[PDB]
């Protein structure tokens, strides 16, 4: 949420996108389509797996410890034993609560970041051939068939090819 | 005419709720549980060496209660004591029971070497109706109950040097007879006294005649004590009566061993983490099954669930 | 500060804005005015209250513990009692210092973020009818009376209505 | 002509300084204090049950020093001991005083049931000039000072079984007489001895004749001991002299109770958190008032202030 | 990485820039040059020094403590002493690991942020006289000699001076 | 024609790897080490007052073993005990040795004021072949070995009041003679007994005749005990034999002092942090040199290195 894309200027997610986390929808002469962006998807996924690698399967061996349950009242030394274990448990419980809360804030933010970077990258690619509608969509001011759309998704779109067509359409009356 | 190009992100029909720094409930596309909260209920017999105590405490197997004869010289990573356990030999106590239990548990062996102590002038191998081995009157296998020879009990003064490269652990005791009749009958004189010493240590014990409430019909008691003897050092027993003597020593090691109170059954299965409720998987970093654990275990926390987000915020269509 | 708006390209705050945290100032034909943006204000405030809910009024009950002051010298066991409590106190003191320092960095950043999102949202809304002066202000290249300004603040500004007027003024000589 | 539209943010004339990860001093529009650093100075009498010890320690009220007769059978969440407290009965000590104090404090009741012990052959209810109740010579209300009957003191051998469903807590003692004259006068023989036992435990105590520095003119001492007796178990007192005997038992509970040293006065007010300096509010998560606390309290930290920002950075005009 | 500039739309760093952390490269009529930006460099450096001030040279005095090595087997009380110290050490070791990992994520992000703010500031400065090529470079649509480039770096570039020249070059056929 | 203007950032040819939240290996332009992992090997003699024990334990210097006569009345911030240390006076032990060592270490002084105890009726200044001072038979400098005068040992009953404004620390002992011959020769009667008391405390000790394994040819032992006496309080020694008596008291302070086992040599150098491996610098916040530390020290952690990034990510050309 800190970048403003997911649950901000992108109004909602797409339940019909099942082959990626981020992607593109288009309307042109040839119809209306969808395609996932793998690079931004993998960038988010790699980062989350990085956090998982630091948390899953990383446990520490302990062996002989102290007693933690007692059948008799004994006073002083038993008080200290219980106090040590209760102290320890509150500190770890605090660590666990904080960890999850911080990691979760960061995961939400990094995923919004990936969305934002894709949007920005695409905006720069289109140069003067398109305008930002404010809701994650670009109005493209030239005929842009499926191969042209494909070229924007693959990073091969040559904006000079369409520039004349686009400037004429953009700065019309 | 032109075209429209929309950037966007996925969403799912079944979101889950996680906590964040700024919001206690936000829905994400996916999450994973960080707290392990269940066991199957069985203590896995691998990869740690489990010794099921069954009817015996560690101390009973140490002292050599006859029903614990199966335990002689055994080792363990983890000794499991059962709540149904019970003693069935001569009534006893151990000042600092907890500490002896702990140091044996932690040594992780009951390996016992016999030694020939010069006990001339007294009768060895005393027995009782309260310690039955193979239908006969017997005693603690590792202890040697010394009484008079020809109604006489001279001053014992017995030495045993540790010329070995390891510590020796000696377990011994003092009989507190139940009446005046049971002080004069076995020891032949009014007042016993025991003094176990080394170059660095001395423990002296005064026997104490008197009735205790009967335990398995017996109103007398044995009190158990221990002495560790280092290489180059020497054990010395002065006694004028009432000595429950060692037959030798225990090897005391250092290692990974311990003890755990549990009634979970032992299963044929492999699990690195043992709790008293049973073994638990150790993929998660935290667990709320039990504060008592052994092995490679998740850390105990008070929470029952902690969801880590593994996907973006879920913003449905 | 991490987004660059508060104490960055916005030179300073406005002491005369008392009805909101973020807002708009304008100059047009009808004069010079100010109005708070409630949505971005509430977004920041909700987030800060979220942190407060996690810190204020959330204490844990403890009852019988160990002794922490002593009238006699005793040695070993008293050393352990003092050591346990001193250990505990340093760990909590560390937790408290870190918590405040991290939360404060995040609060400063989230508030700069809210400022930035508002600015970006407004920039997209104006389309080709305005240019960014670089200091948080837009030069709007058409007659924009109080109702027009109002319409930009309320998200109802129709950029097509003024586009011709604006392009003519923008790409003049 | 056109128009200008500026985006902006508020600022305040009175900023405050907070710490961040990257800067120890940055000014924000507003902040809140996270460390509680003051008390009003009074221990609030609600919502916890406070028992003001006044002139009495917990142990004195337990033993039954006459000035503590007001405390019989009372309960508490928190017992408050005062520095002005003092003993005014027979001089005594308690081996492991700290532990008895702790286990009683934690049990949180002085509920006492009397029991009829068969003390035939001795004179009961011994008294002294050092323990004045209602101008008369008296003793500890919960203890029974046993002396000779017709200049004779036979071997006592008294039993009391716990057939109840709770633990019983027995408090008892041994008189250490100040001279040889005070060993022969009350007990009629040269050397006392006490042995309190159960099925699981035994404590034996040898009285010790000799002068101590006088405390309130008395050079003798009583030494206090305790014994807990479980359901199905039995108490047994063998004695040949010097027994300061129980009149019954204390109920020992488990719960939320404890004890605190403080001289703060008790107020008619409601506060969940008590420290020795007084009650403190518990809205903040941390406090630097006292490491000693009771109830729902902020955690003790070394810092005196910790400001959390509750507003944006302040960038004045 | 969270802002998308360093190891994102800027393809790589410049080993030949040794007088600053961030800067400018240009090509014009007078040749090809480089100059460091001191303000953004110092902004990053101040922030990192801030973290260092909180970690370096800030240690706490301890004196008499408990024993931590033992020559004899003793059981209960020795178990508690060892357990307390082992507990303490795992908690500090956890604090140290987390601290470094969080600070390192933040340092990487704040430095990418400084790069991004400089880029954005420069983009706004150029107004309609330049377009973003998508790789950190601006195509400037007018003659821009060394003094003009200097003026963009020093925040004194007057975009109105070149606007006519630039619009004519930009919206050509 | 026009121009091109590129924004960019530096990079270096020699990057280093750091850990982050999302990646265990990312290269940054520069980093700094947060864990101190080395010492020079010497304990710096400043700024803390170091007392090298050399051949002497703290307890030996306390009791006054002749080779420790150089230590009389010394102070320390840190007392350093050496593994080569050894005792060369009368064989002894201390019940709760660890606690006496700790409380003296922590007091941080051996300041001793002599006091004139009224020891009439006995012979003072007993000596032995096992405690050689200046080629002559001697004893512990701070202890006073009391024996019979004219083959008689009356009941000692000696008082010493603390009218000072500080606590007094009294060290004393009991001789356990090796045979019956060494109980009758020096004390003139079959059984000693010692009772050291105050208004708040009493310690009674029964000597115990019998052989221990010989240590430096001696089979007897001394057992050392201590008593702290507050202002307004009084020390009292009843004895009927076997008293190893004090010659006075130690001042017990509170402060910053302690003790450390180390074999590192002492250097002429300045360092705030001492470990047993030597002094270490304290610029870094963490260290993995030793869990045992004294002074202003980095905190001990299990890791050997922790790199903090001090520069941007390194993205080479
Ligand atoms: C929601 O989030 C979680 C966490 O990101 C995610 O669960 C994870 O999914 C992966 C893949 O489904 C799991 O990885 C498996 O781990 C087990 C070991 O425990 C292995 O047996 C698996 O191996 C498979 O693949 C291998 C080839 O690469 C083969 O060797 C083998 O034959 C298997 O086919 C595999 O590595 C991972 O354990 C979970 N993690 C957790 C914590 O659950 C889940 O997929 C996400 N849900 C959605 C809908 O995206
Ligand atoms: C100090 O007091 C205690 C408690 O009173 C006392 O211990 C008790 O001693 C009696 C008598 O010796 C014990 O009684 C026996 O208990 C067993 C087991 O329960 C019974 O089987 C015995 O029955 C036989 O004796 C009966 C009496 O004549 C016969 O009628 C019967 O047919 C059997 O032959 C017998 O009742 C009792 O168990 C203990 N109690 C406890 C709690 O230990 C102790 O003896 C006293 N001390 C001294 C030195 O006198
Ligand atoms: C600077 O920051 C702090 C923290 O954000 C902020 O102080 C908070 O302000 C609110 C409102 O002033 C306080 O909320 C009150 O809490 C008390 C309980 O302790 C209640 O009595 C109050 O109830 C009022 O409103 C209710 C109706 O909604 C009524 O039921 C009632 O009659 C009251 O009128 C109210 O909920 C909050 O406690 C403080 N928090 C702290 C930690 O101080 C402060 O306002 C900020 N300053 C500025 C200038 O913005
Ligand atoms: C071992 O030594 C100790 C210490 O010396 C000793 O204890 C002391 O005993 C004396 C004599 O019995 C006590 O003296 C009494 O103290 C009270 C209270 O302070 C006074 O009121 C008494 O005054 C009366 O006796 C005087 C002497 O004849 C009369 O002149 C006067 O008019 C009164 O009648 C009296 O002084 C003293 O208090 C204790 N001291 C301490 C610290 O306990 C102990 O008796 C010795 N042990 C043995 C077995 O001898
Ligand atoms: C990689 O990162 C590290 C950390 O940012 C960085 O090392 C630091 O560099 C500075 C300057 O080189 C060091 O500062 C010095 O500290 C010592 C005290 O320990 C002082 O003696 C130094 O004083 C100099 O300057 C003073 C005038 O201002 C004079 O008084 C004096 O005569 C000295 O000339 C100076 O303050 C700092 O200690 C290190 N920190 C660490 C943790 O190493 C390193 O430079 C970075 N590498 C690169 C290539 O950028
Ligand atoms: C209880 O048993 C112990 C262990 O046996 C016993 O202690 C031992 O006593 C003997 C005899 O007194 C000691 O032997 C001496 O040791 C010293 C030092 O090593 C030697 O120098 C002595 O040599 C002289 O005596 C020899 C024998 O006649 C001569 O031949 C020689 O020339 C010397 O004059 C002598 O061997 C022995 O050291 C101790 N051992 C230990 C471990 O302490 C103890 O005496 C017994 N207790 C009782 C009360 O009897
Ligand atoms: C594992 O065993 C522990 C210990 O028996 C269980 O914790 C107890 O749960 C009961 C409820 O049945 C409570 O009354 C006790 O207060 C708990 N005892 C202690 C000592 O904490 C726990 O329920 C079990 N956990 C699982 C997952 O099976
Ligand atoms: C609460 O009481 C504590 C304990 O008395 C106070 O801490 C003591 O303060 C004095 C100064 O008057 C110091 O000399 C002592 O070192 C402190 N004692 C201990 C045991 O730490 C504290 O000042 C009081 N706090 C408040 C807020 O009233
Ligand atoms: C500092 O001294 C400690 C303690 O002697 C060293 O830790 C020991 O290292 C040896 C290897 O030589 C291990 O066998 C032991 O397990 C360690 N002992 C303990 C008690 O932990 C350590 O190597 C030294 N450190 C430095 C930096 O010199
Ligand atoms: C773009 O990429 C897809 C596969 O990823 C390919 O099938 C398509 O032909 C490409 N189109 C263009 C115009 O580059
Ligand atoms: C959502 O549904 C699928 C299909 O039943 C399931 O496997 C998946 O785990 C669910 N995801 C979550 C996060 O609940
Ligand atoms: C343990 O004792 C019980 C009850 O006395 C008995 O039924 C069982 O056979 C014993 N089990 C073993 C393994 O000795
Ligand atoms: C004592 O018992 C063992 C084992 O039953 C036996 O071999 C030994 O000879 C006995 N000792 C004596 C002195 O008879
Ligand atoms: C904008 O909103 C305000 C109130 O929030 C309203 O009074 C005003 O008339 C609105 N104007 C337009 C043009 O939408
Ligand atoms: C600033 O001034 C007002 C008015 O006196 C006051 O109530 C408020 O708490 C002050 N804020 C801060 C953050 O000091
Ligand atoms: C407590 O003792 C003091 C001093 O002896 C006395 O003045 C006061 O009346 C007593 N208070 C109570 C409540 O018994
Ligand atoms: C002992 O004291 C109580 C209470 O004063 C009394 O009722 C009881 O009868 C006394 N005991 C005897 C044996 O007189
Ligand atoms: C820009 O700044 C540099 C020094 O920082 C100066 O030498 C140069 O002349 C300046 N040029 C302009 C055009 O402002
Ligand atoms: C890189 O090289 C220089 C020159 O030898 C050296 O001083 C510097 O510390 C190195 N930096 C790193 C981060 O290794
Ligand atoms: C310490 O003792 C050794 C070995 O007995 C001896 O060589 C050395 O001189 C002594 N050192 C001191 C400082 O007394
Ligand atoms: C005991 O020894 C000291 C010091 O050697 C001496 O001055 C003192 O007079 C001796 N005591 C007696 C009673 O001779």
Residue-wise DSSP of D185-219? HHHSSS---EEEE-SS-EEEE---------BTTB-
Return the C-alpha torsion angle F199, F201, F203, F204, nearest 10.
Answer: 50
> Could you tell me if E73 lies within 8 Å of chain A, comparing CB atoms?
no
How much distance in Å is there from the Cα of D16 to the middle of ligand 3?
A: 18
Q: Which ligand is nearest to the CA of B67?
A: 12
Contact call for residues C88 and A87 (beta carbons, < 8 A): yes
| Separation of alpha carbons B177 and A140, rounded Å | 105
Q: Which contiguous run of DSSP H or E holds residue D278?
A: strand D278-280
In this structure, the residue with its CA closest to atom 10 of ligand 18 is E150
| Nearest chain B residue to F210, by CA | B238
Q: With CB atoms and an 8 Å threshold, state whether F210 touches B195.
A: yes
DSSP SS3 for D274: strand
Q: With CB atoms and an 8 Å threshold, state whether D199 touches B210.
A: no
Question: How, if at all, do strands F234-239 and F194-197 pair?
Answer: antiparallel
Chain A residues within 8 angstroms (CB to CB) of chain D: 72-77, 79
Angle at B47 between CA B42 and CA B49, to 5 degrees: 85
| Separation of alpha carbons D193 and C140, rounded Å | 105
Contact call for residues C168 and C129 (beta carbons, < 8 A): no
- Return all residues near F207 (Cβ < 8 A) that are at least 6 apart: F174, F175, F176, F177, F183, F191, F192, F193, F194, F241, F242
Of the candidates F228, F21, D98, the one whose C-alpha atom is nearest the C-alpha of residue E98 is F21
| Separation of alpha carbons F195 and F204, rounded Å | 4
Choice from A150, A151, A155, A156 to test ligand 10 binding pocket (greatest atom count within 8 A of CB): A150
Query: How many angstroms away from the CA of D34 is the closest CA of chain A?
Result: 17
Q: Is the dihedral of CA E73, E79, E80, E83 positive or negative?
A: positive
Question: How, if at all, do strands B258-261 and D278-280 pair?
Answer: unpaired
Alpha helix segments (H runs only) across chain E: 38-53, 76-126, 146-153, 159-170
Domain around F131:
49-264
Q: Which contiguous run of DSSP H or E holds residue D245?
A: strand D243-246
In this structure, the residue with its CA closest to atom 5 of ligand 5 is F310
Choice from B16, B30, B33 to test ligand 11 binding pocket (greatest atom count within 8 A of CB): B30
Q: With CB atoms and an 8 Å threshold, state whether D98 touches A76.
A: yes
Question: What residue segments make up the domains of chain A, in order of their start?
Answer: 1-173
Report the pocket of ligand 8 as residue ranges, CB < 6 Å. C 69; D 38, 277, 289-290
F280, burial (CB in 10 Å: exposed 0-12, middle 13-18, buried 19+): buried
CA distances from A33 to A9, A27, B8, C67, D183 (A): 21, 7, 13, 72, 108
B230, burial (CB in 10 Å: exposed 0-12, middle 13-18, buried 19+): middle
In this structure, the residue with its CA closest to atom 41 of ligand 4 is D213
F253, burial (CB in 10 Å: exposed 0-12, middle 13-18, buried 19+): middle
Contact call for residues F176 and F91 (beta carbons, < 8 A): no
In this structure, the residue with its CA closest to atom 2 of ligand 21 is F125
Q: Determine the number of helices (DSSP H) and then strands (DSSP E) in chain A.
A: 4, 5
**Chain pair B-F, CB pairs under 8 angstroms:** 28
* Entry resolution (Å): 2.3
β-partners of residue D79 are D51, D259
Say yes or no: CB of residue E65 within 6 Å of ligand 18: no
Q: With CB atoms and an 8 Å threshold, state whether E53 touches D21.
A: no
Question: Per the structure block, which two tokens stand in for D128?
Answer: 């002294």
Q: DSSP string covering chain F, please?
A: --EEEEEEEB--SS-EEE--SS-S-EEES-EEE-EE----S-EEEESS-EEE-TT--HHHHHHT-GGGGGGTT-B-SEEEE-TT----SS-EE-TTHHHHHHHHHHHTB--EEE-----TTEE----EEEEEETTEEE--TTEEE-EEBTTB---EEEEEE--SSS-EEEEEEEEE-SSTHHHHHHHSSS---EEEE-SS-EEEE---------BTTB--EEEEEEEEE-TT-EEEEEESS-EEEESEEEE---SS-EEEE--PPEEEEE-SEEETTEEE--SSSEE-S-S--EEEEPEE-S-S--EEE-SPBP---
Question: Per the structure block, which two tokens stand in for F298?
Answer: 């980095």
Which of C84, C101, C172 to mutate: most A Cβ within 10 Å? C84
| Separation of alpha carbons D104 and D51, rounded Å | 13
Contact call for residues F258 and F102 (beta carbons, < 8 A): no
In this structure, the residue with its CA closest to atom 19 of ligand 4 is D217
What region does D285 belong to: left with phi over 0, alpha with psi -120 to 50, or beta?
Answer: alpha
Contact call for residues E50 and D24 (beta carbons, < 8 A): yes
Nearest-by-Cβ selection for E73 from B98, B101, B228: B228
| Separation of alpha carbons F180 and F208, rounded Å | 10
Count CB atoms within 10 A of the CB of residue B238: 21
DSSP SS3 for D31: strand
Question: What is the topology classification, in CATH, of domain A1-173?
Answer: Hemagglutinin Ectodomain; Chain B (3.90.20)
| Separation of alpha carbons B213 and B220, rounded Å | 9
| Separation of alpha carbons F287 and F300, rounded Å | 5
> If DSSP states are collapsed to H, E and C, what string results for chain B?
CCEEEEEEEECCCCCEEECCCCCCCEEECCEEECEECCCCCCEEEECCCEEECCCCCHHHHHHCCHHHHHHCCCECCEEEECCCCCCCCCCEECCCHHHHHHHHHHHCECCEEECCCCCCCEECCCCEEEEEECCEEECCCCEEECEEECCECCCEEEEEECCCCCCEEEEEEEEECCCCHHHHHHHCCCCCCEEEECCCCEEEECCCCCCCCCECCECCEEEEEEEEECCCCEEEEEECCCEEEECEEEECCCCCCEEEECCCCEEEEECCEEECCEEECCCCCEECCCCCCEEEECEECCCCCCEEECCCECCCC
- Return all residues near F216 (Cβ < 8 A) that are at least 6 apart: F88, F91, F130
Q: With CB atoms and an 8 Å threshold, state whether C2 touches E110.
A: yes
Q: Which contiguous run of DSSP H or E holds residue D300?
A: strand D299-300
- Return all residues near D180 (Cβ < 8 A) that are at least 6 apart: D209
| Separation of alpha carbons B133 and C46, rounded Å | 76
First to last CA, chain F: 28
How much distance in Å is there from the Cα of A20 to the middle of ligand 1?
A: 17
In this structure, the residue with its CA closest to atom 11 of ligand 14 is C150
Contact call for residues D183 and D209 (beta carbons, < 8 A): yes
| Separation of alpha carbons A1 and D47, rounded Å | 43
Q: Which atom of ligand 20 is nearest to the CA of F55?
A: 1
Q: Which ligand is nearest to the CA of D182?
A: 4
Which CATH number belongs to the domain containing residue F197 in this structure?
3.90.209.20
- Return all residues near C49 (Cβ < 8 A) that are at least 6 apart: none
How much distance in Å is there from the Cα of A48 to the middle of ligand 11?
A: 18
| Separation of alpha carbons A144 and A131, rounded Å | 14
Say yes or no: CB of residue F164 within 6 Å of ligand 20: no
| Nearest chain F residue to B239, by CA | F210
């Amino acid at each position: 949420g800190i970048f403003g894309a997911i649950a901000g200027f992108i109004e909602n997610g797409w339940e019909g996108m099942v082959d990626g986390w981020y992607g593109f929808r288009h309307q042109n002469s040839e119809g209306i389509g969808q395609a996932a962006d793998l690079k931004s998807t993998q960038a988010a996924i790699d980062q989350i797996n990085g956090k998982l690698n630091r948390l899953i399967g990383k446990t520490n061996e302990k062996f002989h410890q102290i007693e933690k349950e007692f059948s008799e009242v004994e006073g002083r030394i038993q008080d200290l034993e219980k106090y040590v274990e209760d102290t320890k448990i509150d500190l770890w419980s605090y660590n666990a609560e904080l960890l999850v809360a911080l990691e979760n804030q960061h995961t939400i933010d990094l995923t919004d970041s990936e969305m934002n970077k894709l949007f920005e990258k695409t905006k720069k690619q289109l140069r003067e051939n398109a305008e930002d509608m404010g809701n994650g969509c670009f109005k493209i001011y030239h005929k842009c068939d499926n191969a042209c759309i494909g070229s924007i998704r693959n990073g091969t779109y040559d904006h000079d090819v369409y520039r004349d067509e686009a400037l004429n359409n953009r700065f019309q009356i | 005419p032109g075209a429209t190009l929309c950037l966007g992100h996925h969403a799912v029909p079944n979101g889950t709720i996680v906590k964040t720094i700024t919001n206690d409930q936000i829905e994400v596309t996916n999450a994973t549980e960080l707290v392990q909260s269940s066991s199957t209920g069985e203590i896995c017999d691998s990869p740690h060496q489990i010794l099921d105590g069954e009817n015996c405490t560690l101390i009973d197997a140490l002292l050599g209660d006859p029903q614990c004869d199966g335990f002689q010289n055994k080792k363990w990573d983890l000794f499991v004591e059962r709540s149904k356990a019970y003693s069935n030999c001569y009534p006893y106590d151990v000042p600092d029971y907890a500490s002896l239990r702990s140091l044996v548990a932690s040594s992780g062996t009951l390996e016992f070497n016999n030694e020939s102590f010069n006990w001339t002038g007294v009768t060895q191998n005393g027995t009782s109706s309260a310690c039955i081995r193979r239908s006969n009157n017997s005693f603690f296998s590792r202890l040697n109950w010394l009484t008079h020879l020809k109604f006489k009990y001279p001053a014992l003064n017995v030495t045993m040097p540790n010329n070995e490269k390891f510590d020796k652990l000696y377990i011994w005791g003092v009989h507190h007879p139940g009446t005046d009749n049971d002080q004069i009958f076995p020891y032949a004189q009014a007042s016993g006294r025991i003094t176990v010493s080394t170059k660095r240590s001395q423990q002296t014990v005064i026997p104490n005649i008197g009735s205790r409430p009967r335990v398995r019909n017996i109103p007398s008691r044995i009190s158990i004590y221990w002495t560790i003897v280092k290489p180059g050092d020497i054990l010395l027993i002065n006694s004028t009566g009432n000595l429950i003597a060692p037959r030798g020593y225990f090897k005391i090691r250092s290692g990974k061993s311990s003890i755990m109170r549990s009634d979970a059954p032992i299963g044929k299965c492999n699990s690195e983490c043992i709790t008293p409720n049973g073994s638990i998987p150790n993929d998660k970093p935290f667990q709320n099954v039990n504060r008592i654990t052994y092995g490679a275990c998740p850390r105990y926390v008070k929470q029952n669930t902690l969801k880590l987000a593994t996907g973006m915020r879920n913003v449905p269509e």
